[PDB]
Symmetry: C2
Subunit: 398 residues, 2 copies
């Protein structure tokens, strides 16, 4: 007896465990004070955009012709915006992109949606995610009419279990989603991992008579520490689509600006780029926000104070390790992956909750027995949280 689409109703009515945890912390702040609530739940950028963002926005609003500034760009975005990104990427990675290899989008969620929508031709199409993973991939894959296949986590190094991956590749496999630097683990795939992946997928692509794409979800690319290198995947694998946004690099998550990069070395660039444009059109996208496209021209290479996040990583890692917790030291992103004190991460997160430590069970990310602790938080809160972490530890280790 439902007038609306049931999947849409479910997708809009489903309560987010993480968001509820965030709102629970605000309710707890009212009772015990915000200084006494240790909220490591939601993964929102916490450092301000570099000053070039606000300075450039001010300049466009003051000096750029208002009709031209606020008008529709082409579907794929201004050629000047696309040209500036192609040239920045070539100077940084040694690639050979031009403006026409880019399609400007309204953030990474739009870029991913476009990729699955462009690549899905059948109800039985499968996209592979490597656990632990961003759960919203299932919504985007399902929204395109396809299905998600999870590769069990490499809990030793948080790279890829290639045996497990190879076993889940079949005739229905359209692509493999990778997120490096990673949400939730903070892992960074090495050149070796990227090369083995590329060799495996090239080999399986030939066996099935069809390209298996790499869908590279790269919004944390510049959120990497200690000189660790994030390899540019298009250089290793021909059939690679790159999804990027300025949500983390420039701290503009609410502004909705990113891209889909379609290399010339894909099986048929003209055809795939056409499907990307068509998918964008089908999803109700007309163009990326014009003000932000024009602003991005002057912000290539610019990032916020990334060392603020590194300092938080080191502080949290040092304190948790010193207490006795087993933390995976992350090379990128702003999430720390910590082993729960019991196999049941949900039961462990409840015990954490008893001391107002709001951490997230990794079961939903495809990783039971672990938790995700976001450190895009206030540095002083991390220090004030240590006695509560110590007390939580004591509950298990008397």
């Amino acid at each position: 007896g439902m007038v609306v689409n049931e999947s849409m109703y479910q997708l809009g009515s489903v309560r987010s465990a993480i968001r509820e945890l965030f709102e629970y912390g605000k309710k707890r702040a009212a009772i015990v004070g915000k200084e006494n609530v240790y909220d490591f739940s939601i993964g929102n950028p916490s450092i301000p955009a570099p000053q070039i963002v606000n300075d450039t926005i001010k300049e466009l609003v003051t000096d750029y012709d208002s009709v031209a500034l606020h008008g529709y760009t082409s579907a794929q975005g201004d050629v000047e915006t696309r040209a500036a990104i192609a040239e920045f990427l070539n100077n940084t990675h040694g690639t050979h992109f031009n403006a026409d290899n880019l399609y400007m989008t309204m953030g990474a969620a739009a870029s991913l949606s476009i990729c699955f929508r462009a690549l899905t031709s059948d109800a039985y199409d499968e996209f592979i995610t490597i656990a632990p993973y961003f759960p919203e991939y299932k919504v985007f894959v399902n929204a395109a009419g396809a299905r998600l296949v999870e590769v069990p986590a490499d809990t030793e190094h948080f790279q890829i279990d290639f045996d497990a991956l190879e076993e889940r590749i079949n005739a229905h496999t359209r692509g493999v989603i990778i997120n490096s630097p990673n949400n939730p683990s903070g892992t960074v795939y090495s050149e070796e991992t990227i090369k083995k992946l590329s060799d495996l997928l090239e080999k399986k692509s030939k066996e099935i008579g069809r390209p298996i794409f790499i869908i590279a979800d790269e919004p944390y690319r510049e959120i990497v520490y200690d000189g660790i290198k994030v390899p540019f995947v298009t250089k290793y694998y021909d059939n690679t689509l790159v999804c990027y946004s300025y949500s983390k690099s420039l701290s503009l998550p609410g502004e909705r600006i990113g891209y889909v990069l379609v290399p010339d070395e894909v099986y048929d660039k003209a055809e795939l780029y056409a499907a990307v444009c068509g998918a964008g059109r089908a999803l109700g996208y007309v163009c990326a926000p014009s003000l932000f496209q024009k602003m991005i021209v002057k912000c290539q290479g610019a990032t916020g104070d990334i060392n603020a996040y590194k300092e938080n990583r080191d502080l949290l890692y040092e304190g948790l390790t010193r207490i006795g917790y087993h933390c995976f030291k992350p090379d990128g992103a702003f999430y720390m992956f910590v082993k729960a004190l019991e196999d049941d991460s949900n039961a462990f997160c409840e015990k954490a909750k008893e001391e107002d430590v709001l951490i997230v069970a990794a079961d939903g990310f495809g990783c039971p027995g672990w938790v995700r602790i976001s450190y895009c938080v206030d540095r002083e809160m991390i220090k004030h949280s240590m006695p509560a972490f110590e007390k939580i530890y004591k509950k298990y280790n008397k």
Copy 2:
């Protein structure tokens, strides 16, 4: 078959008549000079935004906290933005909306997309459009997994042929799309047309045992001349979804800011609003652009100089009528609907194309024998085009 989704391939590679006509005019401008080409093809806002827009953007970037200014909003948008709109609508129309009746979107294309995706539950679902109509409705309807049904135009008054509409309503009918003020006719539906529509749909909804919605595409609401009233549809029919954007009112088409309005008076507001939230999520939307949501709070009821468009309407109408063309005098939008000089509009537009006058055959809008002439153009170009229009007229009046 094809490696990508073929339907997405075709959507991204098939050029529209209007776009292909605009490209032709640029090539022609290179050969004979832009002064010798009179382009009335594309319908993009030609007047600047009111100064409050740019002033507010400077203010927000200068004074508002950077992290909070550029951060993610809730999926439905800032409560302050939604509340300011709800209050504006109430003061203007006598309605009783609150913040929770609104969902902020990335333009009217997103608003429309969301409405169709929310409602569609079977492949054979039908959404009715009243010819002449915005051809992109077919794209949004098809992308939602539904079929578009056309009602032939009322070529006497560009209101609605109710017998024709009634005949096309059946068990699959999920909604009727209305667009007043209208692209491409410039018609404004009267209070009576809206009342007759509401009556018909109430009866047919009961007959089929399910609500049939009015999807009211409203981006031209304020582009209305001579004090003509545009009735607020939710006061006439309970099951009404309003899709709006600030693309035409504030001249921000490239910025991607609008909304979907879900009245409490729909059959079940909680269910429908949850479906709208679901569809937004499934379409890859996260939030409308933060900066612009924050800006919209201070721009309620603001518009650019709409009198500039009226002066072009009057000049074009009086000029073409004087020559001998039959023009439907539009009450809103910035498109003039003119009867072709022969039955074949395409053949007529080719004869116009001989004299470097670029006008759009109404066949693609579902209305053969007419043309759309966009007047969101330079005023002096309208004046300079008249000898060419008369020369075109003289080809048929021998």
